Structure formats: structure tokens, C-alpha cells
């Protein structure tokens, strides 16, 4: 769904056609200008940060596994006459439709019996999913995965790719997969009984020598060596695949270019009228394509256990009964060919749509994790209250699109309630502390991180405990579309806090909200302050994340209640503007303004520049030549948003109906 | 009748087409949120179970035996001209109709004489019944039956499959039957005198190679090895079967799929004009598709002796008189094709219609068994007063439909008073003791159950004496639509147990009604209560079921005087998500509230999900409006043009609609 | 075939029965792949003009041309100026204005693709052999690429890219009879024609 | 801005080429383009004294098309305004004050 994911990008940013990705890691952000103004009891001070880079990091590494499941049928492309006055498939009219379009009327009773059983299981989403993955393996087939490389690196702790991904070796993306080929047989017209558990698809003219090899490899098993996002393990779709081609198919060549896969997809969709089936596969890949690099070491807990990708079962009966597919197809929405027309024009745009989607999900799960398990809307019952359709199960895409609705605060709508794709909320839905394996870089590691072994040596491999899941990403593209108090991602804001009395060289902050505001100010001024949690006896630091220049309360790494002892004597000066002061006095007022946003992408510690021309808009209106909006709002999936209502605690988040 | 069985299903239940059954046991039910409360002089203790599963276990096994009986003729199908004003065959118009036809002139006088006997032989219910069973045998053929498997187990008493079903070998449903084929001869139109005691049917065009194999096996003896419900014992319907098909009958293929049986049925109903015959066969199979696994150990008395199935004799004389069947048939009700049209569209919906019917019957036979013989509407005379027709004998479908009418509280209407199918009320009407076999687990069994021995070592085969039949199923689909105080299936309920501090926990229940509600609500709260009768000296436990989680008064297994001593310092916490009664003092007040309902099904201790399209309420009007429409768009290939439009680039072309 | 005729004439075609029998033409189009047509060479300077597989080929050799986009197989003659498009430019009256200054020594660069097509076409009616050279790629195009219609369509370039055509107007050669001469132009040029009667 | 195919942007028009190199000079980016007709390299940093670009620095009267090298854009003088990668329609609005 192009028009949906295209809306998530910020109004100022309009990306160009091509993007030459040449690495397994891409930073994306913006260069903003901050105009700070400070006032306290001592006096006033005015400064200005001329260039500030706020960015996340996203990678092409994510452990996933495929399962074949049975899902709903997509009834789009079938002729409009077999459907009655309502949006329902009548078997009374299928008998009539097949009868009028043949001379041999002996086969009508047999044809109707088989058609009735097959039409209620038609889904080509799993075939297009694999065909799309083959396109990007050939295009970006020079990305290197080194086993003894770094995953996260702060200075105290470190995670290698040996950990998080065991049973892996060093390989390029083209060298990862060695796909076998399934038998692409020819369906001779005259066969009366459709062979069971084998799909048949239509084709335009002669099946090319290259087109055979693509369809053969798309249906086969995926068995990777290196952990890659677009080369994840998938079960075998089918053994055989019939093709009702008037001209006979040619034998498989063995080799194909990425350009040849585009020609295979464009023909397969046009012949079968499977435009809505492609839209499902497009959204399903937008989830998987890229995975987040964690903000802090604790945010690696999300990516330990392998998330399951629900691939629908491959079934189709267009090859057997080509009478059912004619020139007047049935569609629910009039904008039902937009997603394919967008991809075929601008293939590399999927990267930006993928980054936009996975950001929105992992940002909002930062809030859902902090919700107490004694309210109406909680981690267990947030999807069920949101959805207003009838899917098979609240899994895959339904979970992800619910989180996008909660982020943007708008009603998202799909034509069919499809439940296919990655489920992320697995690490969240379990009342157990997660054991992230880490490497010790400095001797003073146990003071900061909640480590098992309290005495360590540089080189030792230990384990850290994570109870509450912290935010994996900060808002960048979705910055200021709706501002929560937790992130505090405002354009303009006036922070007011009262400074605690400095007894010896230490200031006690008993309250939780005041402590968050204090360290948030001192960070924007650019003062590396270090405080001691009195309950646990572990040191917290506002400079936890360098990439995103902000302080979240989850950097304390202790759910519950505590009091902090801030060290006011050892306040280091890392980055100093003219605003920056060391000695606060009385009531601290900081008023900042953010202006002059401009998007910038970094890859392999150099600037990554966009190539090609400017993207012209392709989009169809609500009506072509349709008079009355026959609402048909019974079967269509609808996802209602939730607004965060702030309360006194500040540690707990709460959702309400707007 | 699809219509009346559809209304039995709950409002929240939204069924889909396909149901992938892969076992011989299904736990259908619903998930509800129970808000329990315990109020006392000391204070209130609140609990909340967010997902409480109330289930009824249903199996695919059950001993049945078919017998060929004489039943009324179904006159729906014959041309409307030969019928008089009253609605009976006016012989004289038959002789007129045969004379003005394409019949051989020398046969008219001899055939007209036979008409008086042969035209009143119209009942194809037996053939359609067997052909429907062949459809489901080949569809769900992979289900297994093990000999030494657990039929029932409640901890104390165990009942194996060897006990109830001797002469039983372990085998799959597909490998159970080995059906021999009956002769399908071709009717010679130039036959001198019609052969009575040999049925002759009509057919459209040519009898296919597979249709011969299906009709051959349908009119044959069912001799099963494993006691399956859809493969029970049936006698040989007929030896030979004539088929008036001018196009010759092809010889038997040998093999056929489940889709080929649907092809055979649709041709047979259409040619013979026998839709009311199919409606009778649909309701027959709805009774005897699935049998309920007994709720308690002593509720196995219903399934000891084999209940007889009444199959009406196969008799059809359409082959001899082709002229009398045409396109203008005589029918009583206008909605006479609705039952077939429903089955062809949604075959797997019969499973839901079957469980709805047996749950309605076995619930009502529960509270019919607890009435004294000295009454107006009693055990023996509940069918006679309800029935306002003229059936041959009050058996089969009449006894099952009258029980459904009592449950729902509505008027059930059928077009013909047909008396065919299973008779359930067999063990009830006998009014004698039934001896169910049991294998013991513990050594302290015969205190609880009314056993034949008083001391029994573990692993011994004993006998339980059941006098009054307890309810076999708890109401789940029919929950709080026609509520009785016996089952106590309310949304809101409360009980007030009155105790004084002078009593050291010990309470005596003089009333029987509130004893039942106390013991039931304590089990929702997850507390194992063990009462002891003061008069007799037996013991009862509220934990006497692992499906519903309720206490019915028939679990006492004795009718006498009511003096139940419950000691409230021996209450043990058994389940999870439970409220604790540590030490009560004064008057106790228990209460619960069920708020929302969600349909759930379980199989092999895993969730069984419904897949496929959205099932609609098919009406007679929804198809015949498309017949009124006719697709009246004159079938004329009108090709509309597209004017090319030039713009800035001129290299690429752009087409407009006008 | 009937739906293509409906687009050309711009009328509604009606048949009594929706019959689907006859030849299907749209075969090579829908494939959307490269087609390898065989050719026997005459001259030795062939592969500059045509997108050939070899760069040096001796005369009488059997080579292959790579065709990506399908050029028009026929020019409109019976359907001339009934439903006119700017691609074919099948007007009765037409004109083009090529703007040059005396400081330029005959050399003109066509930034626009549309008026380059009309200039090269009208010069062929006037019987002048013009040979343009693309500045970006470095290939050559000749207006004399047909002996039937006598018009220049833009698909005769045999390449889709950026438009920078250098035409040197002191290498124009008079080829045909009944021709107007461009001996030595100075300033703005204005070409025009008029078709009056048809037989 | 012209579409950057490989690492080269073709400027067919004369006026647009003058405005492009005039912007990049004020930002302070030493851009070098190749004249396709002559085959000689033009540079916007021709005169250091006066900080502006005139069209006569091409040194070819007549008509031509320029191939601008977008990969080899050096950074001689950088203010905070100065960017290397232009995208779409470029707008530059400057004000001159405080003459002495």
C-alpha cells in the first residue's frame, strides 16, 4: 500500500528515484538548527547550535523463520457477473458463467463441483513475496557479512555477530543462497480433472527461457548461510506449477539479471489480475527488508528469539478455468492498481517506506512496554480493541498497522483483512527477564550495566539482565507529528525545573519527573552529568546514546521507585555553546526553537547521495466512472487509533479512546 | 432444513467456510471474562479471570445400526397438471398425460394399469444419505481410532474404548470400509411390463465413469471395522439399480475424489426433481455425524446399547415414466431448494449444524429425565401433545425436532411429516438400571460412585449402577436464551450462606437449591470443596468435571433427604487465577458477572482456527434477483475509443478516457 | 484488432456476438524483452547508425541488431489528418522556427526533441540529406532512413536518452530532384509546407 | 537540477547552466564541467578577486551542451548554507549590507 507508507515520510523530504546501497548499515537523520535561551536566579544567557545531527542506524541483518499457514481468499480479479447484488460469491451464477462461455456443455456439472472447492482458497501473495526477494538479492548482491564484526559498541560493553547469530559463516548476499528449481510443467487444454495440491497460473504468449528459471527458484526452499533480512529461511511453496500458455514453455536457462525478474512480475500480475495479491506482498516485505540497530545495549533483547513470518499457502485455479477471469474484473477500491504502478516505476523507493514502517512500530512499542497490566488497553488486549473486521487471527500485518495508527493518529483501512507477515510482539508477551550476551571492554562495566558477575576482566564474555524492554529507536521521520511527554520531541518547548540544594558537592533528586527535566536541560547545554541511584547503587549517565542527542528515563535501567544523588563537582564539558553554564542557581528555564531541517544519509562513515531524477506523483481518484459509493463496509478491515493521556506517575503510560 | 438449524447458532458466532479437522475429538466452546467477588463481615476479596474457557468435548465415534422401514411417499417433483385441487394424484389425468407424450403406443395400456402402485413409490432419502456419508469419508479420511485409548477419565474412574466397543480393530476412517459395488444396468425403453422391487432413476446426458462407482457403492452394505459415526452399519439398499440414460453407462472407474460425489448429487437432484428428499437426508446426517463425550463417568449409560437408525426403503419409479417429470413441478413451500443450495456452497457448515442439534437434544433430555411419571407432560407422552401433524410413527427426526422446539421455545415447521433418522430416547423409556463398566485408578473409589464392590484394588474392572440418567452435555451455544434454575446458566448470580461465629466453620445446607450454587461458584474461584451427607454417609466433590467447570445436583448420584455438612477449614486451592478463603467469620456473599463472549475451538491440545470466505445467510430472493436481472446487458461487443493527449516530453504517450 | 481501430478513427464499433477468433498481433509488445533480428551488411560503416552487436564488420557478413523499443511498422496514409497526433505530425499545414545568430558558423544545437523531428522531416521533403550527431552518447542519425513515406519519425534515433543534437549546416547535400537549395543561411530560418489536393 | 545519471548532469540550456554555477559559487563549491562540442574544461573559480561567475568564462561563442562532474565537487570555502548534493528545484535568496 504505497499511498499509506508514502504519507509517513516528513513533508520537507521528497526522495529521488535511485539509491546505490553498498553496505549492511545505513544512518538516516536530519541537520537541524537549535536556538536555546537560558534564564535562572544568577542571570540570563543566550546561545545557538548551528548544526546538530539527530539520526538512527538501520541494518540488513535479522534472524527470521517462515511458516506456511491457511489464510482468507482474495476475491479480486474474478468477473463481476458471478457476484450477486451484495459482495458475496454465489455458486448459482458460477454454473451460468461457465455454461455460456463454451460449446462442450458435458463438462459443466464437473467444472462447477471443483470450482466451488478451489475459489475459497486462492492466494498468490507468497509467490510475489519470493519473486520480490529474488529481485533485491540480484540488485544489492555485493553486501558482505563478517562474523567477527561489531553489532553494538558504546565503550564499556560490546556485542559481536558471533553472539546473537550462532550457526553462521562469512559470505556475500549472492553467495548466501544456492536455490534449486521446481518442475514448471505445461497444462495441455483437454485435461478434465484438476490434479489436487498443484496451482495453475495464466501467462501472456510464450514463457521466456529466463522466466522459467525465476518461477522455478521462487517456489523452491530458501536455506541461507549468513543471517540476511531478504534471504530468511522459507519452507517449500509447491512441488509442481502448471502454466496455461498457448505457446509451449522453453527449458530453464540457469542465469537471470535483476531486470528479467521485473518482466516476470509485470506479466504474471497482468494475466492473472492479481493486483491486490501484490499489495499484500509489498507491505509484507516492508516489515522484513530492514531491522533496527539497537539504541542502547539493553535494546538487543528484541532480536534474540527468531520472529515467525506467516507466509500464506499457494493455491490458484485460473489456469484450469480461464472463463472466470475476463475483461470486467470485480474490485472493492478504485485505487486497486496503484501499488504495482508505484513499484514498477520506482523500485528503490521500498527502502524509504520500510524504514518509515519499522521506525513507527519500534517507537510506539516503547510506550506499550511501559503500560501497567491492570487497565482496559494493555499489551495483551490492545490489538483486539483496535481492529473492526473479521480476520483469521490478530497476527502479522494487523499488529504492525495497529501500531502505525497509534503513532500517526489516523484511521488506516485495507480492502481485505489479510493476516500475513512478521509478528514482532514475542519478546514483549512473556513475564521473564531476557539474558543478553555481552563482551566486557572496560574493567568498570559492572557499575553501569546489571551484570551477573560483579568482578570482570577486559576480554571476558558475561551476561546482562533486561526486565523492561527499552525503546529500540528514537522518532526521526515521525518527529513532532504527535508529541508525548516521554520522548519530548517538540519543535518549541519551555522546560522549567527547580534545582535541589547542593549540600557538600551532591544534589538529592527524590522526584522522578524533576530528575528527567534536569538531565534533559544539561544535555541540550552539553554537560556530561553522572548520578548514583541510591536503591541499586549503580551509576546513570545522560550521555548514553551519541547518535540521537536526547535523554530518555529508560537509560536509568531500573523499573520501580528510587532517589538519585547527582555529582555536581564532576560535571565535564564535552560540547559547549555560549548558552552552556556549569553552576545552576534556583529555578532553571530553557526555551529552544528548532528550524532549517534537511535530510542526510551516511553509509560506511561517508555521505550516501541519492542519484537519478525527481519522483513525479502517480495516484488514482476515488471514482473512474462510478456513480454511487456502495459503501460495502462489512468485510473491510479498519484500525482505530489510541491517544496517550499523561498522568502524575510519569513512569507509567496509559491509553484512552479519542 | 438449513434455515431452522442456522438460527440455533449464537449471535457472536461468525462462521467461515473451511474447517481443517485432523482428529477424532474437538473441544468447541467460548472465552468469557468472569468478575468474581467474595463479601464478608471482615471485608471483600475481588478476583478476575480474563480468559475463562467453558467447553463441551465432541467425538467422531458412536455405535449405530441401520434398519430398513416403510415410510410415507414424498410427492414433491411430479408435474402440477396430474394433481387435483385437494393435492393427490387424480388418475385419469395420468392416462391423458402418458397418451400425449413420446411413449411407445403398445406400452400405454399396460403401463397405465401399473401406475396405481408405482407412482406412490417416491422416497430417495436412503440414497442421498449414503452418498453424503461417502463425501465426508473421503474428505476427513486421515482421522485415526486407537483400540487402547481413553474414552473418559476423571482421576477416580477410567473408561477405555475396549470396554464400550468390543469386536473393534484399530484403523483409519479411509481403511475402515471395503464397499462392494452393486450392478448399475441401463433401462431398455422398449420393456414389456415394468419390474417392481427394482428402482429406476433419471440422469442428465451420459453417466460418467466415476458416477457409476459412486452409485454402485452408495447402494451397498456398510460393514465397518472401527466404530465410526459416518461409517456405521447399514443394510443393502438394493441389488440392482436401473438408470434411464439414452447415452450409455460407462463402466466403473474404481477410484474417485470427494469433489466427484458433489457432481453425482447435483445431477441426481436436478434430473429427478427431488429437493425435499435431500432436505430429509440432510437432517438425518445432522443427528448422526458426531456423538458427545460424556460430561461425567456415570453419563455413559446413554451410549451402552446401540441406538437404531430408521432408513426408509429405496423406491423410485421415474425411469419408467419420463413424461411425468418436467420443468413445472408441484411443491408445497416456495423455499424448497434452499437446503441443497446451502450444502453445495458451504459443505463444512454441517459440522456446526450437527453440534447445535445434539447439544439442544441432550440438554433437554437432561431435565426431562428429572420429572415424575404421575404428570400430564412426562417421559412417555412429551412427543404426542407437541406434534400437530399425521406421521406414521413418533420416531427418528420428530423426537429430535420436538426437543429443539422445547429448548429454543419456537414453532418448527416441515413440509412433509417424515419419520426417519436416529432415535435417542431409548435408555430413558426403558426405566431400568444400566451397568456401565469402569477400570479403577485410586483405591477410595466406591465412596464417591455407587459401585458394585466396596473394596477394589487399583487396575480392577468394576461396574457402576446408574439409576437416573445425568445430563450428557452442558448448554454452551444455547447459554442464557431459555434459562432454567437446574443448569443455572445466568450472566449474573449470587448465593448467601448464613453462619454464626459460635459455629467453627461447619455449615449444614438444609436447602438443596443454594447448596448447588455455593459448590458451583466455589469451583469458578478455584477451591476444592468436599461435602459429606449426614443421613446416608456418602461424599460429593464439586471437582467432578474438566470441561464446563460447573456443579449440577445430579453429581450426588443419590435422591434422598438433604443434610450436607461442609467443613470450611479443609478447602484447598487447586487452580490458578483464584480468590482465597483463608478464615471466614459471619455471613458469606459470593457473586460473579460474565461480560463478553469470543468463540474458540481446540483439537489435539492446540487451537483450531476457521479459514476461508465469510459465510452469508443465503435467501431464495438473492439468486432469483440475478434471474430477474438475467444480465439484460445485450451481448453486443461495444468497443469505446481513447483519444491520445500530448504533453511536455512528447517521447512517452498518455491516453485519456473521453 | 477492433479496439485498436476504435482508437484510430475515434468511433464506437458494435458486433452482434462477442466472438474471439482470428490473428493476435500484440505478441512481441507484451513480452517486453530484447529481439535479435538478423541482417547482412552492405557498407563497412554500419554499426555507428544501427545498434549492432559488432563494432567492426566486413561487407557481406551476417550480423544481429538489438531492438529494445518497437518502432512504427507503417505510416498513416488512408487515415491521414482525420485523428492527428504530434508524433506522426500528419498535418496539411506545418511550420518550424530554428533560431541561429551570425556569431554561430552554421552549427545549431536542438535542446528540444519535438522541433528537431519537424526540422529533419521538412528538410527531406525539400530533398536535403542532413546528418545530425548526438553530443552526449556520440552516435549519428540521418533523415534519409526510408524510401516510401519520405518522413522522419523520432524512433529513427534508435536510443532514448538526453537531447543534444549538433547539426552542421555546411554539410547539407542535395540528393533528390524538385528541391529548394540552402546555399548559406544567416539568422533565423522558417520552413513551411501546404498539401492542397489528393489523388 | 538536471538528473544525475552515473555521476554526470547534462545542462543543454545556456541560461540554466549560468544560474546553477552562480549558486554553487556563492555557496563556495569549485565545480568543473566539460563542454561537449569543443572538449575543453570550464571552471566557475576563474577569477578569485571578484567572487562571481560570468558566462564568458566558458570561452566559446556559439551554442553547446555542458556535462557537469557532480562527484568531484571540491569544498574550497564553506559557510553553514554550503551543501554538496542539490535535489529538485534550487532556491537561493541573498542580501548584501554593511559596505565599506
Author numbering:
A (entry chain CO), B (entry chain CP): 1 to 658
C (entry chain AB): 400 to 598
D (entry chain AP): 499 to 598
Pull verbatim passages from the article behind this deposition.
The two-dimensional classification of L-BC particle images identified a subpopulation of 9% of particles missing segments of their capsids. Asymmetric reconstruction of the open particles lacking a large segment of its capsid with the opening centered around a fivefold axis. The borders of the capsid opening are formed by poorly resolved density which may be caused by the limited number of images (1120) available for the reconstruction or by variations in the structure of individual open particles. The structures of capsid proteins from the empty particle were fitted into the other reconstructions. The existence of the open particles together with domain swapping within a decamer provides evidence that Totiviridae capsids assemble from the decamers of capsid proteins. Furthermore, the open particles may be assembly intermediates that are prepared for the incorporation of the virus (+) strand RNA.
